Design a protein around this nucleic acid. Sequence first.
DNA 1: CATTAGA
DNA 2: TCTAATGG
Length: 327
Amino acid sequence: ETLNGGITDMLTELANFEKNVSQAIHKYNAYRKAASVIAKYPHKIKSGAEAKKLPGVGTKIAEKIDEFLATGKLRKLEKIRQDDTSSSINFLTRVSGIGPSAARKFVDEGIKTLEDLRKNEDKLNHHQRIGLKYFGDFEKRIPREEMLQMQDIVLNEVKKVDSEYIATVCGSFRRGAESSGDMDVLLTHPSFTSESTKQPKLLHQVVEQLQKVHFITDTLSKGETKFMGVCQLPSKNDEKEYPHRRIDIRLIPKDQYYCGVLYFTGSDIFNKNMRAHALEKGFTINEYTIRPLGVTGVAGEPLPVDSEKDIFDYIQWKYREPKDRSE
DNA sequence: CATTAGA
DNA sequence: TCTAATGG
Ligand SMILES: [Mn+2]
Ligand code: NA
Ligand code: NA
């Protein structure tokens, strides 16, 4: 957690770089297990050798470890940090839509800069166009203050369209968080569950409405189950206009809301931990259900969920407010 | 790990 | 169809 910091750290610096700038999935995969292990190790690694003893630890990484233990640096790392080409891929990637592959290819052609990206808006598809368009607003965090207004609005139209709609803005905002990155609404409806062969419209209707009023300004991707866009709060009695925000809405078969709802709320740890517990408590939990465990090794039979509680009660736990789902 | 764009 | 990018 701290004893092996610089280590796992440089480790990751490395691994990442393989996978992005290079297409060394493996080496990339290597630095990670390694960084994964050394991370767990209970003692101050003093040298390569010591390290080396580890599973995942080979001669290469080990080798690096020394150089870094000896000198508070690494050349390879020092070179890569410098390398513009590689600096470039690191940056382009930040565009919503730009992946590595693409990051590289642009570079290839010579698109390195943000402006470059501009003079060639043509080479870009919608996603990346909008991504590049809202580059600024996309990097900024979402003040809860705003988080509250947004949530407000979404709630209303949803109810406005059909009253039967159930919606929950999940994630960190849900867990109290003073700020958020994008907003995630989980949607559902009674008329839609596990069996009942869809109602794509279900998702559609809402999207349309949010648009109607001018909440959703653009569509990044919309399918019959997961919309993915941009929104903005009505810029008041002017002088201050809102930033373009990322938003995602997903339809959910009512007989799997809470689990999913549980889930997306996290935290990442709380989840796992809760997850680890239901296991002992004779269960299994996943983004959609919770099946009582059977001794033959495994078992199925999805339990009946009506609220965050049911799941709790299931594994026999203390209902935890979202506020305290911290871990 | 699963859902959408695209080519 | 596969392959990329997002999320989570
Ligand atoms: Mn979020
Ligand atoms: Na070894
Ligand atoms: Na990106």
